[PDB]
Design an enzyme around this catalytic site. Structure first.
Site, mmCIF file in Angstrom:
data_model
loop_
_atom_site.group_PDB
_atom_site.id
_atom_site.type_symbol
_atom_site.label_atom_id
_atom_site.label_comp_id
_atom_site.label_asym_id
_atom_site.label_seq_id
_atom_site.Cartn_x
_atom_site.Cartn_y
_atom_site.Cartn_z
ATOM 1 N N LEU A 94 -4.786 2.329 9.440
ATOM 2 C CA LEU A 94 -5.500 3.482 9.489
ATOM 3 C C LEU A 94 -6.327 3.637 8.364
ATOM 4 C CD1 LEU A 94 -3.009 6.042 10.956
ATOM 5 C CD2 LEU A 94 -4.416 5.387 11.779
ATOM 6 N N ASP A 117 8.482 16.727 8.916
ATOM 7 C CA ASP A 117 8.032 16.679 7.207
ATOM 8 C C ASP A 117 6.129 16.242 7.575
ATOM 9 O OD1 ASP A 117 8.292 15.773 4.929
ATOM 10 O OD2 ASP A 117 7.826 13.530 5.312
ATOM 11 N N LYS A 122 4.797 -1.825 8.072
ATOM 12 C CA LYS A 122 6.545 -0.570 7.621
ATOM 13 C C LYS A 122 7.775 -1.120 7.353
ATOM 14 C CE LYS A 122 8.693 3.775 7.865
ATOM 15 N NZ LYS A 122 8.351 4.936 8.524
ATOM 16 N N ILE A 170 0.844 -1.229 0.409
ATOM 17 C CA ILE A 170 0.084 -0.064 -0.308
ATOM 18 C C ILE A 170 0.605 1.337 -0.152
ATOM 19 C CG2 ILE A 170 -2.737 -0.924 0.832
ATOM 20 C CD1 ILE A 170 -1.075 -0.425 3.533
ATOM 21 N N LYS A 184 4.645 3.119 0.433
ATOM 22 C CA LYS A 184 6.307 2.706 -0.486
ATOM 23 C C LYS A 184 7.249 4.767 -0.818
ATOM 24 C CE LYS A 184 9.619 0.694 -4.391
ATOM 25 N NZ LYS A 184 8.521 -0.488 -5.217
ATOM 26 N N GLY A 185 8.192 4.137 -0.085
ATOM 27 C CA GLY A 185 9.296 5.267 -0.022
ATOM 28 C C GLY A 185 10.056 5.209 0.127
HETATM 29 C C1 LIG Z 1 -1.870 3.509 5.404
HETATM 30 O O1 LIG Z 1 -1.817 2.848 7.131
HETATM 31 C C2 LIG Z 1 -0.842 3.121 7.767
HETATM 32 C C3 LIG Z 1 -0.346 3.343 9.207
HETATM 33 C C4 LIG Z 1 0.433 3.482 9.804
HETATM 34 C C5 LIG Z 1 1.429 4.151 9.223
HETATM 35 S S1 LIG Z 1 2.833 4.852 9.150
HETATM 36 C C6 LIG Z 1 3.677 4.890 7.732
HETATM 37 N N1 LIG Z 1 4.941 5.000 7.282
HETATM 38 C C7 LIG Z 1 4.605 6.405 6.479
HETATM 39 C C8 LIG Z 1 3.614 6.794 5.501
HETATM 40 O O2 LIG Z 1 5.965 6.718 6.279
HETATM 41 N N2 LIG Z 1 2.236 4.543 7.098
HETATM 42 C C9 LIG Z 1 1.417 4.478 7.176
HETATM 43 C C10 LIG Z 1 0.185 3.483 6.685
#
Ligand SMILES: COc1ccc2sc(NC(C)=O)nc2c1
Length: 342
Positions: A108, A154, A55, A32, A34-35
């Site tokens: 979330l 950020d 993560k 879902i 990515k980074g």
């Molecule tokens: C979409 O649900 C989530 C819940 C916690 C985190 S923590 C995280 N880390 C990021 C977005 O860099 N992405 C999410 C996504």
């Protein structure tokens, strides 16, 4: 043509396979997020019997060492959050799976940028904005606890996620870049659209830079469009300038990167360098927000809670959030005492 016994790829990420069972606990569903850090997958926890978000960090020290700092701060916040009231994402637990540090976060829903895209960047109600604006000021109030003194470094619509899609309860995520109060180690911080003047100007920074970011974000939520959408720092500072005017002299006299944007004339005053932009302070937020003209693009005309008095309070708070001087910029506690919220 193999790396980490066929689990990893050339980018050091994990190869997310659907329905893969992990440690007799987590059932993987789908990639879902990515980074830089790595990837973020949706998965089902057998023990807690719930949907969680794992993560998955990359398999190299650079990203691994940064992830244990994120953990260190996530856990320290969870120690003080206790009764999950201050809108910080809950780090349930973390572990190593096949040389990948994994952080298990509560599941979330859609981020605030997803809402903008679903409104075709037309924005959301002032009333919904107030809710996010209050919840965010409480979160920044929580991060300003002396023991934490955490700077997110950020903030933006995609690092603010809703708990439930039917409810407006928010949670802030991603503390991978989170600067805990310290000395000026870093410079090129924050995302560009939401980058404070003190960061742009190469000056010291503190928790006030998240407040700036909040101001930008709140305006972006109602209008639907970024308040300062610069292609680069010089354009960025110019877009801030044409709304808020020239930064005060006492700020620029100290700014080590003042000459990247401004000239110090023999007079001693400060003016813009040449380059498309309206004169300083002319694109007023009063006009941008559409205070006297039925909101952004006249689309809020007649809607309840979108009167001139409602828009004046909102505008007034934002101006305090966008104070050039980080010392006089409104703090979380005072921001919550503002009419806009009452
Ligand atoms: C979409 O649900 C989530 C819940 C916690 C985190 S923590 C995280 N880390 C990021 C977005 O860099 N992405 C999410 C996504």
């Amino acid at each position: 043509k193999v790396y980490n016994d066929g689990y990893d790829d050339d980018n050091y990420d994990y190869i997310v396979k659907n329905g893969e069972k992990w440690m007799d606990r987590y059932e993987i569903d789908s990639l879902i997020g990515k980074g830089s850090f790595g990837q973020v997958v949706k998965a089902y926890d057998r023990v807690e019997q719930e949907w969680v978000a794992i993560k998955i960090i990359k398999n190299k020290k650079a990203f691994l060492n940064q992830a244990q700092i994120e953990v260190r701060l996530l856990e320290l916040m969870n120690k003080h959050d206790t009764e999950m009231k201050y809108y910080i994402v809950h780090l349930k637990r973390h572990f190593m799976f096949r040389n990948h540090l994994c952080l298990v976060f509560e599941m979330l829903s859609y981020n605030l940028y997803d809402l903008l895209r679903n409104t075709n960047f037309r924005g959301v109600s002032l009333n919904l904005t107030r809710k996010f604006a209050q919840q965010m000021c409480t979160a920044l109030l929580f991060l300003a606890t002396p023991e934490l003194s955490i700077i997110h470094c950020d903030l933006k619509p995609e690092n603010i996620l809703l708990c439930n899609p039917k409810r407006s309860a928010i949670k802030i995520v991603d503390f991978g870049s989170s600067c805990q109060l310290g000395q000026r180690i870093y410079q090129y911080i924050q995302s560009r659209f939401y980058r404070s003047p003190e960061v742009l100007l190469g000056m010291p920074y503190d928790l006030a830079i998240d407040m700036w970011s909040l101001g930008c974000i709140l305006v972006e939520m109602h209008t639907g469009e970024p308040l300062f959408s610069g292609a680069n720092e010089v354009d960025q500072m110019n877009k801030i300038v044409e709304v808020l005017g020239i930064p005060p002299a006492h700020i620029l006299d100290q700014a080590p990167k003042a000459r990247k944007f401004f000239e110090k004339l023999p007079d001693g005053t400060w003016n813009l360098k040449k380059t498309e932009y309206k004169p300083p302070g002319t694109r007023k937020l009063h006009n941008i927000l559409g205070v006297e003209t039925g909101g952004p693009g006249g689309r809020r005309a007649g809607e309840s809670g979108h009167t001139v008095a409602d828009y004046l309070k909102f505008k007034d708070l934002i101006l305090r959030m966008l104070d050039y001087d980080p010392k006089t910029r409104i703090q979380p506690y005072y921001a919550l005492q503002h009419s806009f919220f009452k």
